[PDB]
Each structure stands twice: as structure tokens, then as C-alpha cells.
């Protein structure tokens, strides 16, 4: 329990404890007992794991980072010459401290001592050490561009020699990209780079690069899917503008016969970056079919389904039929969050208007409404209905044929389930005017249709406030007058004056001098009555613009 209680307070909160009194010397102790012998294997392992995990919290300044770098390097060299388990973690922790401290640079002794060490070690627990060192070198090269562009000839020559496929492959690819970009930015090329410089921080090449790409592809057969995806993504970045892609065409075509979440995205971004150079006019069709298939294939988890359902909608075109729209069209066998990924397809199909797609949309939205009206269910159902309504409204503002049933269904749904007041308010606050107005009219008609004796008044008044205007005066005034007697709690007594304030803003003048008057004279809480008095005075004594400027 020498260091366990020490690291507990830090891994509870790094920035909080490092801002405390004891954390001032925590890094000092940790660097001190690095070469000690009183610390067991487990304590050293745990301390070095923390040194891995948060290099930004104990050595902020560049000078402190350099000092810690030299200290770690010293205790790594000065280790006992016996097989132990501090070899790789020490190098990786020093790399983390140097890279995240900002003290790395060619003009510093710590970096000039660390970099040759990692280069030699990775050049070749020997295999795990080599892998760890290669990863450290690649990460350092990522931190400062070109930092590790020194031994490219070594890896080129020793590709068949010792060294794990994945680390050297990734490091070589990253170095190629960074070095070639920098040198072509200068104006020159590789200049013999195929055979530890620090100056990069500030024809034959085609054949050499073709050899590089074939070697990378050949060695990539061992690459795991995730690393394979990043390799191909950055390669498709690099060689888009800078030999035909028919070298990598067989591999890409073969990999598109898969459905793994990473190779599919590698193929998708490869086509979205390379554009229409390699894509055929019909290969886009097969890719679209497979993405749509994978958007609903039972053998895959929900996340993969929804990922490809988002990919298909924003699919990247090469040179900007109905059956594909029938392999993904929504149903009511779909879990709540997998329909809205499919609603755009149905809105697209029905916009240009087998049962009539409007009829199927009516049945689907009617099922969603019937789910929503079920009292005693979760809120996911109502959220589904309203998000679907928003998507169709934005997508189909311009066809009253499909929209009149939607408006009628929403009105009936409000009549059935008054507890959904906030959802309608948000929808009204988002949708455009072409749908804001008729829905406003019909929902006002629904709310003022009842005499006003319901127990859902606290849910009616919210819509009444969110919709009241100067179109239908007398009906609204009658409904509000009836509802005045059914307000006993402060919540409804504020929704009601929210309605009156909405009328205020609209500009209605006559009769309101009595509606607001009666509300102010016949409510329960004093605060609502004073609210009404103020708003009635504002409407009665203001000119039209000054109310918008002084109320």
C-alpha cells in the first residue's frame, strides 16, 4: 500500500489532485524512485502506467518535461541487466512525456538522446519491445512532421528481415505521406530518401512510389481491419492528386464483398475522396445496394445498421431505382431509432407524387399516432411521432395532398393525448410558415372546440399561448372565458396569461379590453391577476409599434 493510496487520489481526479498541495512533489517522487530497489514490480508497473496515461498533468513546462525526459532515459539505461518488466513501458512513458509536454525538438539534448535510442531499438520480450519502440517512433513522427524520416532506406531494405508487419507498415506509410508532402511543398522530391535529419521541421520517383505502394499492399494482408481502414484512408488522402489505381483495384473490390464496419467506411471514403476515377457507373449501384442491404440485415447489431442507414442518405456521388427504395422503406417492425433513419427514403419516394406511397405513409404515421395515444407508455413513442412529423414537414412543405392528412392526424392525436403539449410547441417553433399557419389554425380549432371543462386544461393552455393570433377572435375569447373558471393552480394561471400576452403581441384590440379584464378580475393567485392587469394596460394604452418596443 506504498503507492496504491498515492495513485488513488490522482486517478480519482488528475487535475484536482495535481492542483492540491501534495501533488507539487508527486512527479518529483515518481521520478526519484524510478531507479530505486525498494519498489516492487507491481508498484513500478502501476506508477509507469500513470506516467503513460497523463503526461500533461505533472510536467507542464518545457524545461520540466525535458528534465523528466532525461531522468526517465537515465533510469531506463541504468536498469539491472536481468529480464524484467519495465523495458517497454519506460520507453513509452518517456515518449508520452516528451510528446505531450511540448519539449520535443532537434535543439534539445533529451530529444537527441531519446530518438537514436528508439530508432536503434525498433531497428532490431525482444519482439514486444520492438513493437513498442516502433509504435513510439511512429507516434513521435506524428507529433512533429518528418521527425522520424531518417531510416526509410533501412525499412525498405529490411522489409523481408526481422520486424512485425503492422508497426513498420504503418510507420512507413505515415513517413511517406509526411515527407512527400513536405518535400513537394518545398518544390523538390524524395531526393534519394528511399535509401537522423532534423531540417524538415522548418521520373524515377514514380517507379519508386509504385514499388512502395505494392509493398504496402502486399504487407497489408496481415493488417487488422481497424488499422487497415486508417492505412487506406490516409493513402487515399495522399495519392489523390500526386500509375493507375488498378494495382489496388483487386484488393478494394474483394474487400467490398465484406460488411465489417471499418472496411466499408474505408471503401466509402476512398470513393468519396478519389471521386469518379475508379468507380464505374454501375459499381455505384452495387455499392448502394450493399449499403442498403447492410442497413437492415439481421446478422448485424443495431449500430452497424444505423451507420449504413446514415451513409446511404449522404452517399457520395460520382458524376452528379424504386426497388432499392423498397429494400429499406420504413415499417412498424422497426425499433424507434431505426425508422427516422428510413423516413427520408419514404419522403423522397413520395415527393414525386403498388399502393400510393401517400397511403403507406398515412398507415405508418397512423400506427405511430396509435402508439403515441396509448396512455401508459414511454416517451420514446411520442418523440418518434413528432420527429417523424418534423422530417416529413421539412421534406414535404409543398404538397397539400399528403399534408392535409398529416395535419388532421396531428390534430386528432392532440385530441386523444393532451399530455403531448411541449412536443407541439417545439414543432411549431421549428417548422416553416407554409406549415406553421394551417397547423396553427387546425390545432386552435381543436383546442377551442371543447367547452373547456376538461382536466387537461394545463396542457391546452400551452398550445393556446403558442398559437393565439388575430385571426379567429370570438371563438378564442369564448373558450378562454369558459376556461377561466377551471384554473385553480398557478401553472394554468400562467399558461392563460401566456395566451393573453400572445394576443397582446398579435395586436388584437377590441373585446380583449374585456377578456383580459375578466381574467384579471376572476383568477385565483394574485400574481396571475397582476400579470393580467399589466398586460391589459399595455394593450389598452400603447400604439402598435411602441408595444413591440416598450413591452
Amino acid at each position: 500500500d506504498a503507492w496504491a493510496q498515492r495513485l488513488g487520489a490522482f486517478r480519482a481526479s488528475p487535475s484536482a489532485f495535481m492542483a492540491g498541495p501534495e501533488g507539487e512533489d508527486l512527479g518529483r517522487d515518481l521520478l526519484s524512485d524510478l531507479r530505486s530497489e525498494k519498489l516492487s514490480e507491481q508498484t513500478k508497473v502501476s506508477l509507469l502506467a500513470l506516467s503513460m496515461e497523463y503526461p500533461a498533468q505533472l510536467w507542464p513546462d518545457a524545461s520540466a518535461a525535458e528534465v523528466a525526459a532525461t531522468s526517465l532515459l537515465d533510469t531506463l539505461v541504468l536498469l539491472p541487466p536481468r529480464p524484467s518488466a519495465l523495458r517497454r513501458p519506460l520507453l513509452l512513458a518517456a515518449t508520452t512525456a516528451l510528446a505531450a509536454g511540448g519539449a520535443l525538438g532537434p535543439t534539445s539534448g533529451a530529444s537527441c538522446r531519446l530518438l537514436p535510442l528508439l530508432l536503434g531499438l525498433a531497428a532490431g520480450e525482444q519482439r514486444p519491445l520492438q513493437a513498442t519502440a516502433c509504435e513510439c517512433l511512429r507516434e513521435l513522427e506524428s507529433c512533429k512532421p518528418g521527425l522520424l524520416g531518417g531510416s526509410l532506406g533501412l525499412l525498405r531494405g529490411l522489409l523481408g528481415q526481422e520486424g512485425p508487419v503492422q508497426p513498420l507498415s504503418l510507420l512507413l506509410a505515415l513517413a511517406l505521406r509526411n515527407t512527400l508532402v513536405l518535400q513537394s511543398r518545398v518544390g523538390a522530391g524524395l531526393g534519394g530518401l528511399l535509401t537522423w535529419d532534423w531540417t524538415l521541421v522548418e521520373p524515377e520517383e514514380a517507379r519508386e512510389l509504385r514499388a512502395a505502394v505494392i509493398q504496402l499492399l502486399d504487407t497489408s494482408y496481415l493488417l487488422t481491419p481497424v488499422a487497415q481502414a486508417q492505412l487506406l484512408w490516409l493513402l487515399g488522402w495522399a495519392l489523390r492528386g500526386l500509375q493507375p489505381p488498378a494495382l489496388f483495384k483487386p484488393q478494394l473490390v474483394r474487400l467490398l464483398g465484406t460488411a465489417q464496419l471499418t472496411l466499408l467506411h474505408a471503401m466509402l471514403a476512398l470513393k468519396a475522396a478519389f471521386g469518379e476515377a475508379l468507380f464505374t457507373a454501375q459499381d455505384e449501384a452495387l455499392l448502394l445496394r450493399r449499403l442498403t442491404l447492410a442497413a437492415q440485415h439481421p446478422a448485424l447489431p443495431p449500430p452497424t445498421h444505423l451507420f449504413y442507414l446514415h451513409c446511404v442518405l449522404s452517399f457520395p456521388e460520382n458524376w452528379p431505382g424504386p426497388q432499392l427504395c423498397r429494400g429499406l422503406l420504413p415499417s412498424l417492425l422497426h425499433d424507434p431509432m431505426a425508422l427516422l433513419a428510413r423516413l427520408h427514403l419514404l419522403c423522397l419516394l413520395c415527393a414525386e407524387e403498388l399502393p400510393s406511397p401517400r397511403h403507406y405513409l398515412e398507415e405508418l404515421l397512423a400506427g405511430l399516432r396509435q402508439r403515441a395515444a396509448l396512455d401508459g407508455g414511454p416517451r420514446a413513442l411520442a418523440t418518434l411521432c413528432f420527429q417523424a412529423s418534423y422530417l416529413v414537414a421539412c421534406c414535404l412543405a409543398g404538397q397539400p395532398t399528403v399534408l392535409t392528412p398529416l395535419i388532421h392526424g396531428l390534430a386528432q392525436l392532440y385530441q386523444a393525448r393532451p399530455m403531448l403539449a411541449p412536443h407541439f410547441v417545439d414543432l411549431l417553433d421549428q417548422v416553416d410558415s407554409e406549415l406553421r399557419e394551417p397547423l396553427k389554425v387546425v390545432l386552435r380549432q381543436v383546442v377551442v372546440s371543447r367547452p373547456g371543462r376538461d382536466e387537461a386544461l394545463c396542457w391546452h393552455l400551452q398550445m393556446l399561448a403558442k398559437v393565439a393570433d388575430g385571426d379567429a377572435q370570438s371563438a378564442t375569447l369564448n373558450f378562454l372565458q369558459a376556461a377561466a373558471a377551471h384554473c385553480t393552480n398557478w401553472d394554468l394561471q400562467q399558461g392563460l396569461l401566456r395566451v393573453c400576452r400572445a394576443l397582446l403581441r398579435a395586436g388584437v384590440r377590441g373585446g380583449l379590453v374585456d377578456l383580459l379584464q375578466v381574467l384579471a378580475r376572476q383568477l385565483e393567485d394574485p400574481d396571475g391577476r397582476d400579470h393580467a392587469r399589466l398586460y391589459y394596460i399595455l394593450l389598452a394604452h400603447l400604439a402598435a409599434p411602441k408595444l413591440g418596443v416598450a413591452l
Binding site: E139, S331, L333, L381, Q430
Partner: protein
Amino acid sequence: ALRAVWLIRHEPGTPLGGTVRFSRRYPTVEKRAKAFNGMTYVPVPEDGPFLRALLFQLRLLDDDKDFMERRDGCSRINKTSIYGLSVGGEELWPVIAFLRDSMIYASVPLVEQALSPRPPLISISGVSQGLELLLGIQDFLYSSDLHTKLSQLPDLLLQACPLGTLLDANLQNSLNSINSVQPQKQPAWKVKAQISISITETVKCMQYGKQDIADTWQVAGTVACKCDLEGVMPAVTISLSLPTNGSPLQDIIVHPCVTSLDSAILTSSSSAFSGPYKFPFTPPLESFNLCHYTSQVPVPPILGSYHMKEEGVQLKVTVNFKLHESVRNNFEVCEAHIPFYNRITHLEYKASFGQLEVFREKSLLVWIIGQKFPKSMEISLSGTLTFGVKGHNKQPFDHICIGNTAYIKLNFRIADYTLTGCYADQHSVQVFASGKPKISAYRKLISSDYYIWNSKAPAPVTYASLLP
């Protein structure tokens, strides 16, 4: 390149919501995020605030709130599992998550461009990378050992994701490489030819049974194999012998380790030959799946019906089944469970075969048909189920079952008889190597979703079912 990784077990009722079992942050990538993003940078919070925000956004922490416009809004639509967290007045983006068997998985990747316009998700590689790592962890932890699996995880993934960049997504391989210590291009996920192909064709069928409405059945199948043979490059591609009565393969997708899929597999979506099944693979230390197939057969295996005349409190479920002759008459568990959503006090039943044991809750009488149907191939239940005080919330509330609409949930299973016709063959082994394939093939049948849909009531319908 991620920024951090998580694994939070779902703990209902606890105010914190769970106890993190894994929280590794890579600060090299955070400095990279500063350098790349610039003015749009938003830092990664600590464990506590992250857990609070993620459980809030996943709708898993106290969903009883009336309306939170930051979550339930009509303008914030989440059509993908890549959510955007809002921590410390900053919109963290992108944050990944999914749930299965009470185990959350999460990650925040790196985007190498500014966030002032939210870049399209068809471009960020990190979303795919985070999702795949999370799926690999999910497969590892609940593969089949209660805490010896979750204890070694921090010492497990470090060997796979040391400094923010993944190496291999199979955590079983991290266990193989850490606990146990390649001069050729041996695959980076590998540390007497015996193969255990466990094919499994689940018959889900909303049989319905109307005139214009089609009877909706579809069988979901898969093949789990392994070329777990010694040698340098042994070759064992197995053949599955669907008969002449059986259709060719249907709905083929493959494994990440799998090489490719045929142009017909790309075409035949929802060569068309029964052979020779030549499936290229790459011998894994994992279990390679050369394909997952959902075969079609025109003959439904079981047919059913259901009427519930709501004569007050008399849910007379005059059921009537029809066991197609192609189905072997020996069912391991043909429990024709009959849940009673939205509704047994008085089991005044008339069971033709097998007990109809009302369960102790007296809410859903799971009528165990048992093991085999009678010689009449028809059960029935004219039960005067005189239910007492109307349960409005106690009963299982299933929205896909309202009113006189419902269906019998037959949880029926069968050993080695499915609806497709899989039969692996070994005498036709053709390869560029030599060996003895011990192809321990198999099959099964499960009730994925076998709702014998009541034709005396409306049923939800898919798209093509109404299509003539």
C-alpha cells in the same frame, strides 16, 4: 485514432448509473486535437461528468422527465449511434455509444479538421474505428468467468491500443498475446483439420394469413467455422449440400477476415448454383465465417390462427394451428406462450392438449403445449378468462398488441431441423493442400419472431407485404 475509451456497466437505480470498469485517455491525441481543431477545440471531461452526460443522452438515466428539449426535441434527431455530448458549455463531438445486455461501450475519436461546420460523418474514420473497437469488446466480454474477464481488461486492451491508435479489435487476441508470448507475413490477429460449423436458421414469421397481405416469413442464418488446423498454409474449404428441392444461397454477407463475396451475393439481395461452394478464407485464430446466409424456402413450416372475441371479460382465444408435414413431430420446447398484454383470474379453459398453466402472476397464462402436437395438429382454448380488477399498468404493456390484436408468442425450438436444408459435405474436398477435415456440422431452429398473427384483427405490415 481515438481520444479515450470506456466501458460502463449499466446499473439501474443507482444515482451514478454505474461503475466504470475502463477509462483510458490518450493525451498525445488530445494535443493533436488542439493543433488540428484550433478555435473549435472542446476538451474531454473527467469520468463523472462524462458518465452523467452520456447516460442522459442515451436516454438511460431517469427518463421520467416531462420534456428536455436538449434530448427529446423535435429538432435533435439521432439517426446514427454517434451522439454529440454537451459538457462544460461545450458541445463535445463526436461521442459513440451502444447498449446490449446491460453493458455500455463508448469512445470519442479524432477529427483532423475544424468543427465550425460539423463535417459529414461519411468522412471521419474515427467513428468507424471507435464503433469497431467497442463491438470487439462487447463480443469479448459476453462471449459465453464472472469477473476474471472484466478484471484483466485494463491489462488487456493496453496491448492493443497503447497510445490512441488501435492495432487489433479482437480482445481475445490481446488475452492470447499478453498471457502467452512470426518470420513471415502471418496475420496480426493470430497467436488435424477440425471445424465446428454451427449453422443456425431462426424462423421468424408474421404469418398473418390474409388475402392481399402476404404471409411474412424469413429465416436468418449464419455459419461459424474455424480452419483450426496446423501446417503452413493448409486449405480446407467446406461444401454445404442443399438439395434440388432447396434453393441456392440467399442474402450473403461475410466476415471482416473473409476475403470477398461473389457478384451474385452482391446481386441476390432481398452464381445461383448449389455448388461447387468455393469460399475463399484466411485461416484465423478466430472463428472465420465464410458467409452469413438467409436461405428461402417457399413452404412455411407451421401455420396458425387466433380469434379473441372480446365478449366482456371472455377472451375466448379459439386458437387453431397447422403443423406442415415437412416439420418433424418432436419439439424440444414448443411452448406456445400466449402473453396477455393490455388484459387470468378464472382459467375456465378447455385445453385440447397439454396443460395451460396460468403463471403465478395471473397476468399471462403461458400455455405449455409441451413437446409434441396431438394427432389432430390443433390446440384450442375457449377459456372464460374472468379477469378481475382491470390491470391497466401491471400487465406487460406491449404496444404492438392493442385490443383484439395480438398473436401467440410460440417460443418453439428444434434440434437439427430448420427451414432451409443445410447439409455440409466432406467427400468433395478440393484444395491445394492435404488433410482430413473433421467437419462437425450442425443446425437448429429457434423462434426469432414467430407471431401467429391473429387474422381476426389488424396487424402491423411491412412494405412489400401489401405489394402485389
